[PDB]
Every structure is written in C-alpha cells, then in structure tokens.
Design an enzyme around this catalytic site. Structure first.
Site, PDB file in Angstrom:
ATOM      1  N   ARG A   1      12.702 -41.365  25.638  1.00 41.48           N
ATOM      2  CA  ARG A   1      12.856 -42.018  26.933  1.00 41.48           C
ATOM      3  C   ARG A   1      11.578 -41.790  27.742  1.00 41.48           C
ATOM      4  O   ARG A   1      11.283 -40.659  28.137  1.00 41.48           O
ATOM      5  CB  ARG A   1      14.081 -41.468  27.659  1.00 41.48           C
ATOM      6  CG  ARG A   1      14.407 -42.183  28.951  1.00 41.48           C
ATOM      7  CD  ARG A   1      15.602 -41.556  29.613  1.00 41.48           C
ATOM      8  NE  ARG A   1      16.205 -42.438  30.614  1.00 41.48           N
ATOM      9  CZ  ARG A   1      15.895 -42.431  31.905  1.00 41.48           C
ATOM     10  NH1 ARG A   1      14.969 -41.594  32.367  1.00 41.48           N
ATOM     11  NH2 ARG A   1      16.509 -43.274  32.736  1.00 41.48           N
TER      12      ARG A   1
ATOM     13  N   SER B   1      16.478 -47.795  32.057  1.00 50.14           N
ATOM     14  CA  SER B   1      15.897 -46.792  31.180  1.00 50.14           C
ATOM     15  C   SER B   1      14.810 -47.435  30.328  1.00 50.14           C
ATOM     16  O   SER B   1      14.991 -48.542  29.814  1.00 50.14           O
ATOM     17  CB  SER B   1      16.970 -46.170  30.263  1.00 50.14           C
ATOM     18  OG  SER B   1      17.835 -45.320  31.005  1.00 50.14           O
TER      19      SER B   1
ATOM     20  N   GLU C   1      23.488 -41.902  24.236  1.00 48.78           N
ATOM     21  CA  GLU C   1      23.094 -43.258  24.610  1.00 48.78           C
ATOM     22  C   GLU C   1      21.859 -43.719  23.839  1.00 48.78           C
ATOM     23  O   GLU C   1      21.804 -44.862  23.375  1.00 48.78           O
ATOM     24  CB  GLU C   1      22.838 -43.307  26.124  1.00 48.78           C
ATOM     25  CG  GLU C   1      23.329 -44.556  26.857  1.00 48.78           C
ATOM     26  CD  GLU C   1      23.174 -44.439  28.381  1.00 48.78           C
ATOM     27  OE1 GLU C   1      22.502 -45.292  29.001  1.00 48.78           O
ATOM     28  OE2 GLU C   1      23.732 -43.492  28.968  1.00 48.78           O
TER      29      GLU C   1
ATOM     30  N   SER D   1      23.021 -50.688  35.174  1.00 50.83           N
ATOM     31  CA  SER D   1      23.064 -50.317  36.589  1.00 50.83           C
ATOM     32  C   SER D   1      21.670 -49.957  37.092  1.00 50.83           C
ATOM     33  O   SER D   1      21.199 -50.483  38.108  1.00 50.83           O
ATOM     34  CB  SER D   1      24.012 -49.138  36.801  1.00 50.83           C
ATOM     35  OG  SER D   1      25.246 -49.336  36.120  1.00 50.83           O
TER      36      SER D   1
HETATM   37  N1  LIG Z   1      30.628 -59.441  34.677  1.00 56.13           N
HETATM   38  C1  LIG Z   1      29.734 -58.605  35.212  1.00 56.13           C
HETATM   39  N2  LIG Z   1      30.157 -57.686  36.111  1.00 56.13           N
HETATM   40  C2  LIG Z   1      29.262 -56.851  36.646  1.00 56.13           C
HETATM   41  N3  LIG Z   1      27.947 -56.779  36.422  1.00 56.13           N
HETATM   42  C3  LIG Z   1      27.553 -57.703  35.539  1.00 56.13           C
HETATM   43  C4  LIG Z   1      28.363 -58.630  34.902  1.00 56.13           C
HETATM   44  N4  LIG Z   1      27.617 -59.416  34.038  1.00 56.13           N
HETATM   45  C5  LIG Z   1      26.398 -58.961  34.174  1.00 56.13           C
HETATM   46  N5  LIG Z   1      26.279 -57.932  35.073  1.00 56.13           N
HETATM   47  C6  LIG Z   1      25.037 -57.236  35.362  1.00 56.13           C
HETATM   48  O1  LIG Z   1      24.854 -56.256  34.358  1.00 56.13           O
HETATM   49  C7  LIG Z   1      24.682 -54.955  34.947  1.00 56.13           C
HETATM   50  C8  LIG Z   1      25.336 -53.920  34.066  1.00 56.13           C
HETATM   51  O2  LIG Z   1      24.685 -53.935  32.784  1.00 56.13           O
HETATM   52  P1  LIG Z   1      25.089 -52.887  31.676  1.00 56.13           P
HETATM   53  O3  LIG Z   1      23.990 -52.890  30.611  1.00 56.13           O
HETATM   54  O4  LIG Z   1      26.446 -53.227  31.134  1.00 56.13           O
HETATM   55  O5  LIG Z   1      25.068 -51.525  32.498  1.00 56.13           O
HETATM   56  P2  LIG Z   1      25.941 -50.248  32.341  1.00 56.13           P
HETATM   57  O6  LIG Z   1      25.940 -49.735  30.932  1.00 56.13           O
HETATM   58  O7  LIG Z   1      27.377 -50.545  32.781  1.00 56.13           O
HETATM   59  N6  LIG Z   1      25.240 -49.138  33.371  1.00 56.13           N
HETATM   60  P3  LIG Z   1      24.443 -47.773  32.775  1.00 56.13           P
HETATM   61  O8  LIG Z   1      25.395 -46.525  32.870  1.00 56.13           O
HETATM   62  O9  LIG Z   1      23.279 -47.519  33.722  1.00 56.13           O
HETATM   63  O10 LIG Z   1      23.879 -47.901  31.308  1.00 56.13           O
HETATM   64  C9  LIG Z   1      25.242 -55.070  36.362  1.00 56.13           C
HETATM   65  O11 LIG Z   1      24.526 -54.193  37.223  1.00 56.13           O
HETATM   66  C10 LIG Z   1      24.971 -56.533  36.724  1.00 56.13           C
HETATM   67  O12 LIG Z   1      23.682 -56.772  37.271  1.00 56.13           O
HETATM   68  O1  LIG Z   2      15.311 -42.453  35.305  1.00 57.94           O
HETATM   69  C1  LIG Z   2      15.442 -42.405  36.482  1.00 57.94           C
HETATM   70  C2  LIG Z   2      16.544 -43.187  37.213  1.00 57.94           C
HETATM   71  C3  LIG Z   2      17.705 -43.406  36.237  1.00 57.94           C
HETATM   72  C4  LIG Z   2      18.550 -42.359  35.836  1.00 57.94           C
HETATM   73  C5  LIG Z   2      19.593 -42.623  34.934  1.00 57.94           C
HETATM   74  C6  LIG Z   2      19.760 -43.934  34.457  1.00 57.94           C
HETATM   75  C7  LIG Z   2      20.876 -44.329  33.464  1.00 57.94           C
HETATM   76  C8  LIG Z   2      22.234 -43.628  33.484  1.00 57.94           C
HETATM   77  C9  LIG Z   2      21.298 -43.453  32.282  1.00 57.94           C
HETATM   78  C10 LIG Z   2      18.903 -44.958  34.860  1.00 57.94           C
HETATM   79  F1  LIG Z   2      19.082 -46.229  34.376  1.00 57.94           F
HETATM   80  C11 LIG Z   2      17.875 -44.693  35.753  1.00 57.94           C
HETATM   81  N1  LIG Z   2      14.574 -41.557  37.292  1.00 57.94           N
HETATM   82  C12 LIG Z   2      13.525 -40.785  36.759  1.00 57.94           C
HETATM   83  C13 LIG Z   2      12.204 -41.283  37.344  1.00 57.94           C
HETATM   84  N2  LIG Z   2      12.258 -41.370  38.852  1.00 57.94           N
HETATM   85  C14 LIG Z   2      11.158 -40.937  39.676  1.00 57.94           C
HETATM   86  C15 LIG Z   2      11.313 -40.847  41.067  1.00 57.94           C
HETATM   87  C16 LIG Z   2      10.182 -40.418  41.793  1.00 57.94           C
HETATM   88  C17 LIG Z   2       9.025 -40.112  41.060  1.00 57.94           C
HETATM   89 CL1  LIG Z   2       7.577 -39.546  41.914  1.00 57.94          CL
HETATM   90  N3  LIG Z   2       8.971 -40.223  39.760  1.00 57.94           N
HETATM   91  N4  LIG Z   2      10.041 -40.637  39.078  1.00 57.94           N
HETATM   92  C18 LIG Z   2      13.477 -42.052  39.390  1.00 57.94           C
HETATM   93  C19 LIG Z   2      14.713 -41.477  38.696  1.00 57.94           C
HETATM   94 MG   LIG Z   3      24.486 -48.973  29.765  1.00 58.66          MG
END
Ligand SMILES: Nc1ncnc2c1ncn2[C@@H]1O[C@H](COP(=O)(O)OP(=O)(O)NP(=O)(O)O)[C@@H](O)[C@H]1O
Ligand SMILES: O=C(Cc1ccc(C2CC2)c(F)c1)N1CCN(c2ccc(Cl)nn2)CC1
Ligand SMILES: [Mg+2]
Ligand SMILES: Nc1ncnc2c1ncn2[C@@H]1O[C@H](COP(=O)(O)OP(=O)(O)NP(=O)(O)O)[C@@H](O)[C@H]1O
Ligand SMILES: O=C(Cc1ccc(C2CC2)c(F)c1)N1CCN(c2ccc(Cl)nn2)CC1
Ligand SMILES: [Mg+2]
Lengths: 352, 352
Positions: B190, B178, B121, B175
């Site tokens: 990161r 990062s 990623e 979701s």
């Molecule tokens: N059509 C859509 N459907 C769902 N969510 C949407 C949409 N358009 C925007 N969003 C928003 O965009 C977010 C998802 O963004 P995105 O960057 O695509 O995440 P992701 O890659 O799927 N999740 P991650 O695994 O954490 O990287 C959702 O949580 C919503 O807040």
């Molecule tokens: O990064 C994350 C959460 C996370 C994980 C993974 C993804 C995406 C799929 C790749 C994310 F968008 C977000 N965390 C590390 C830091 N956290 C804490 C918690 C308590 C304390 Cl005391 N400190 N730190 C929270 C968890």
């Molecule tokens: Mg993503």
C-alpha cells in the site's frame, strides 16, 4: 515616486511599501504634495477605506533598501476592490506580479504615464522569501516550526534557521495551491499544484455553513468536531487497521458520514466548518509529503494566506507531516506568510 | 455448503457466489433443502429484499473453480443492511475481507457453527484482480482504456491486455482511496491513500444538493456546469498561464467562485453536483499520477465502486492522466470494478 510592490492574486491584493526615514531637509522641500499626502495617508492609517488593512505587526523597521534606510510596510485588500484602488490612483513605476498583473494590465494603464512592469509569480515568491529571511524579522527568526508536534503538552512554536536554505519545497496555499522545488537562488521549478486550497475552504464553508468571512469560518471551525462529518478508520474496521499502520483516528472518508440522512440532520455548522478545514489541510499535507519524497527534499515551507490567523491548520500540518513521514519531514512556517510575492516584485525595481 | 466470498466495505457489501452447474443426479438427491432453497433464491431473483442487487451482466459463466464447473455471480447491498442479511442467515465457511470482516466478526458468529475466516483487504484485491483478468470476461478483455482520450470525437473504450501485469499501480476508490503498488504476485504494498473518495462525493453532494442516491447525484452532475462553482486559471490570469504550461481551462480553485455571495445565489444544484464530482475525480487523478511517478510505474488501474455507472469520472480520469503526464501514463479500467476483494476472499477457501 513611491516604492511599491504588488501581488494581485485571485482573492487578495498584497502590497509592500517602502517608507524612507532618511528624508533630508532638501528632499522634503523638493517633494510634491501628492507624494507627501500618499506617505501621510499610508503611515497615518491602519484601515484604508472599508476593506484595506495594514498588517502593522509585520513592519520591517530601519531596513536598508536600494541605498536608503526606511520601513517596509505590508498592506492587503480584496482583489474585488481593485477598481476602488485604481480609481483612488486616478484622483510611478509599478512592479506587479500574480495573475492579476496580466488580467488587470489595461486597467492600471488608465493611470496616466504609470509604467506597469509584470514579473512572474515564481521568481517574485522565491526572491521575496529569501530576502525577508536574509534580513530577519527585526532581528528575530523569520522561519519557525512546531517542536514536538506529536505531543500537545509539549507542542510549541520554535525558531528555525535557513542560513543555507537549499533545497526547499515551498507550498503556496492561496486560492489554490502551487508547489515549488527550490534548489538554488537561480534554480527552481513548479513541481505541481492542487486546486484544493484556501478558496475551496472558504467557498465550501460558505455553502455549508453560511459564514460570511474567512475569520468567521475559522471561528466556527474552532468550535466544531470534524468526526461528526468524517468517517474514521475505526468506523470501518472497529479499531486500528494494524496491517498497514493506519490508526483508528485517521480519516478514511472525508464527509463520509454525511451519506446518512440521520447524520446530516444532526451535524452542526461548526462541525461542517471543521471538517472542511481538516479535509483541505490534510490533503495539502499529503500532496506536500508526496512531492517532498519525489524531489528528495526534507524541508517543506508553507506560505500563502490560507494560514494567516489559522493556527488550527498550522498545527494540523505540523503534526501530520511529522506523523505520516515517520519524522522524515519538517513542516516550516514564515511570519510574512502572504507577502513574499509583493516583496519580490518590489525587489525587481532596479531593473527599470 | 455454498461457496461465497464477501467484502464488507464501509459503504457496500460485495458478495461473490459460485453456482455449480455440474450437479450430478446423486449430488442433487443428497443435498439439504436449505441448500437447495439458497441456490434457488439467489439464481431466481435479481433483487433481494429492497436493497440487494445481482449484477447479472458481470456473471462469469462455465468457469472451472476448485475442480467444479459453475457460474460466478456478483451481488451487492448496503453495509447498513448487513443486520438484515445476518438475520436472514439465522432463519458454511465464510471467507470475508474488508474492514467489516473485523467490525462485524461477532455478529457473523451469531450464526450457529458458521466459521468466519478473515482475510486481508490487500491480498484479496490483488488475488481477485489477477484471477478475473486471467480467466477473461467470458472471452472478452477484463481490462480496458479510453483510446485518444484527448480528442472527444475519437475517444472510445478499447480493450487492454494484462498478460504480464507487472508492475501495476492499483487505485481503489471506495469510501476513501487506497493506492497499491504491485510488483509481482507475492510482492505488493500500500503506497498511500487519500480520504477524498467516493464517500466524499456522495456526502458533499447530499449536503449541497439534497440528492438521495449515488445515481441521482451522478444524474445531477451530468446536467451541471462545474465552472459555475470553480475558479479557473483564466479567471485569475485572464487566459493561460504560459510560463508553467497551465491552460486557461484548468481549475485553479475548486469551489473558489463560491466565496462570492452573488455566485452562491445563482449556482444550481446540478452545477454543485458536477463541481463535487470534478473536484474529487481530479484530486484522485493527481494523487495517482504523483504515486506512479514515485513508484516508477506507468500503468494505473482504477477500481472500486465510485466508478460504477460513472463514465463522467472515467473519461475525466482518462483525459487528465494522459494530459498532465504528457502521455507518460495510461488510465486503465476493469469491468468487475467493485468486486475483486470478494473474489479474492472466495479464492482463499481451500486454505480451510
Ligand atoms: N448503490 C450505491 N450506494 C452507495 N454508494 C455507491 C453506490 N454505487 C456506487 N457507489 C459509490 O461507490 C462508493 C463505495 O465503493 P466501494 O468500493 O464499494 O467502497 P467500500 O468498500 O464500501 N468502502 P471501503 O471500506 O473504503 O473499501 C461510494 O462511496 C459511492 O461513491
Ligand atoms: O490512507 C489514508 C486515508 C485512508 C485510510 C483508510 C482507507 C480505507 C479503509 C481502508 C482509505 F481508503 C483511506 N491516509 C494516510 C495518508 N494521509 C496523510 C494525511 C496527511 C499527510 Cl501530511 N500525509 N498523509 C491521509 C490518511
Ligand atoms: Mg472497499
Ligand atoms: N481576509 C481574507 N479574505 C479572504 N480570504 C482570506 C482572508 N484571510 C485569509 N484568507 C485565506 O487566504 C486565501 C488567499 O490567500 P492568498 O495567498 O492571498 O491567495 P491569492 O494570491 O489571492 N490567490 P492565487 O491567485 O491563487 O495566488 C483565501 O482563499 C482564504 O482561505
Ligand atoms: O496546478 C494545478 C491547479 C492550479 C493552477 C493554478 C494555480 C495558481 C494560479 C497560480 C493553483 F494554485 C493551482 N493543476 C495541475 C495539476 N492538476 C492535475 C489534475 C489531474 C491530474 Cl491526473 N494531474 N494533475 C490539477 C491542476
Ligand atoms: Mg497568490
């Protein structure tokens, strides 16, 4: 006049009262009946009206303050019921802090000849915290931590010494969160704050679950499973995210499973209460860790009433700070969690 | 074989497809019908099935990639519908990133002889972002900010140059969130993340308001008043908190007015949608600011799909980062917000 200190917060009023126990024969005769009935009312009841509570287990006994021996009492009630408190008062020098010392200033002055002295939230918190730790909790440590917070079979509350307490990061979890860096008795700053605090937990919980009290919300959370609402790292990766040391159990998206209608329909109110608590607590922990790193402080003390009768959040904070800091930071807690501003206010009394 | 890159996130699958436009007479004859019907299907439709969408306005035209001229297309659909995508594929070298490249690895291999190469990623996001900015958005800036984000009468989108882009703080709001610190083309880390991201907004919104789509949630939020749910500094102090430079309008406790039953009964679903959006957005902004300060980076770029068709959150981030950093930090945005991982994956194609 009685010796009070008052911290009027956005949610709770905290009151510290010093009861002298060295009352001489002459002093008892030359005391006005209303003063006598105040002391009687406060020391003979543990509930006051329908919403006031004396936290009897916190009492500091045989304390020497301002050259008198007495007992320090700790009392709380909802800010919402402050009009009742003021009306009772209309049927004294008041040192008051918290936002409500400004907001309700004019109301306190409806009490004839009462002198209201407003003191800043920050000075009061720091002064009160350092004082209570300095006099000890009736000979016991005021400060404690959770030893071996990583293993649950070993995890237990242990005392922690703060004889030289500086530097200190103080995380005040009230309605919101204030974060302070304390470098000495006269050198402290508010580093930042967050609006995701105790009022967020209580407000969101009441919206999602219909709970009607802080304690009911915690009781629902103790029975819940937050992973029903939260999307975990393993839900996205199928396991750990090895490359960045993210374990499969870490929360990737709080409430992130609630985007699916079928999951919203099967989740329980207890699950949502626990996800609310976990979301707020982890976010406070993470903000605390980032501030500690930037201030170069490794001792983080958590205060405020979000943590009263809330061992779930304390253990979560203990485990998370130790895990995510790779053991660089210690989560510390204090027995008199919610009352340090009220004590610090009382301690400003000689200045008037 | 067609040139794809795919980022399978927790919520959305993002697909970048390179359409060659220099197809010679001989190349067109010597091409298999299934390859022809793939290109036809993808370039003659903007909706695919019932949940696939081609973002036509993002197309990069007459790009030279891997020694061919062509158009770069950007396509998205719900991760939930990936089984439909794979079934269509069973009726090619695939460079894939995101958590779903691991989770659904075995499913992609049900496509005979398809070679799946998983890419991280982080490398993909950084490589894609730097590439798109380097080729420009059809001659226009890929990167932009909101000038004079403090005054609304002056606040307007303006282009921003990233010809030397380092250092850079990249805040990826998917979701979850990062946060990356980019010091050079081959030196990035990161920094941390938060679980309060786009899935939190969407999940909480659906629980509180019954909304059934991201766009409906944003539409409810545009009509709401978050101060109906949130407790403000002036609700606690009666005004500003002068001593710490907290304006009366700052949020002291998100959803903190929802602890009162009478307020829960009068708040509207639109108010709760706006308070959800404001709460999530401000918390991302604050975490971004603390990381910028600790990494000593003053340029913060926000990506991910939480910000697509979401100008409320962009303006909120622009205003908040400028206000709370006293002008030390710039909020920066990118036109190809959600697609940089998919582009970076495509760019790993020569390695195989
Ligand atoms: N059509 C859509 N459907 C769902 N969510 C949407 C949409 N358009 C925007 N969003 C928003 O965009 C977010 C998802 O963004 P995105 O960057 O695509 O995440 P992701 O890659 O799927 N999740 P991650 O695994 O954490 O990287 C959702 O949580 C919503 O807040
Ligand atoms: O990064 C994350 C959460 C996370 C994980 C993974 C993804 C995406 C799929 C790749 C994310 F968008 C977000 N965390 C590390 C830091 N956290 C804490 C918690 C308590 C304390 Cl005391 N400190 N730190 C929270 C968890
Ligand atoms: Mg993503
Ligand atoms: N009996 C209770 N009633 C309400 N909230 C409670 C109670 N016990 C614990 N809490 C929690 O404690 C929080 C209030 O903590 P407290 O430190 O007293 O804040 P405050 O001073 O009133 N607010 P602030 O103006 O931001 O400093 C609430 O938001 C709840 O999460
Ligand atoms: O401190 C706070 C919130 C607050 C205020 C007041 C009190 C109690 C009454 C005394 C609190 F517990 C908490 N904020 C400053 C930092 N914030 C941001 C936001 C965006 C960005 Cl980009 N940066 N920072 C959020 C607001
Ligand atoms: Mg308080």
């Amino acid at each position: 006049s009685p010796w009070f200190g008052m911290d009027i917060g956005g949610t709770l009023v905290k009151l510290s009262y010093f009861e002298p126990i060295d009352i001489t024969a002459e002093e008892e005769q030359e005391e006005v009946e209303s003063l006598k009935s105040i002391r009687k009312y406060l020391t003979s009841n543990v509930a006051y009206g329908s919403t006031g509570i004396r936290d009897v287990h916190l009492e500091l006994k045989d304390l020497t303050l301002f050259g008198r021996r007495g007992n320090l009492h700790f009392i709380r009630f909802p800010t919402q019921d402050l009009p009742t408190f003021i009306q009772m008062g209309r049927d004294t020098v008041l040192c008051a802090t918290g936002g409500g010392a400004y907001k309700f200033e004019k109301d306190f002055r409806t009490i004839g000849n009462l002198h209201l002295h407003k003191l800043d939230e920050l000075d009061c918190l720091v002064k009160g915290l350092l004082y209570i730790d300095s006099v000890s909790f009736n000979g016991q440590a005021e400060c404690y931590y959770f030893a071996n917070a990583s293993e649950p079979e070993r995890c237990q509350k242990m005392p922690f010494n703060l004889d030289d307490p500086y530097p200190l990061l103080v995380v005040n979890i009230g309605s919101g969160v204030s974060i302070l860096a304390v470098h000495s008795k006269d050198n402290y700053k508010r580093v930042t704050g967050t609006s995701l605090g105790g009022g967020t937990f209580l407000g969101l919980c009441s919206l999602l679950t219909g709970c009607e009290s802080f304690e009911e919300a915690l009781e629902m959370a103790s029975k819940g499973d937050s992973t029903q609402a939260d999307k975990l790292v393993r839900d996205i990766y199928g396991g750990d995210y090895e490359r960045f040391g993210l374990p499969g159990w870490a929360v990737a998206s709080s409430f992130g499973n609630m985007i699916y209608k079928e999951k919203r329909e099967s989740v329980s109110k207890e699950d949502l209460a626990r996800a609310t608590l976990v979301t707020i607590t982890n976010n406070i922990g993470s903000v605390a860790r980032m501030c500690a790193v930037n201030e170069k402080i490794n001792r983080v003390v958590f205060v405020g009433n979000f943590l009263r009768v809330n061992t779930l959040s304390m253990k979560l904070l203990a485990y998370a700070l130790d895990y995510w800091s790779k053991g660089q930071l210690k989560a510390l807690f204090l027995e008199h969690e919610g009352y340090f501003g009220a004590v610090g206010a009382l301690l400003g009394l000689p200045n008037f």
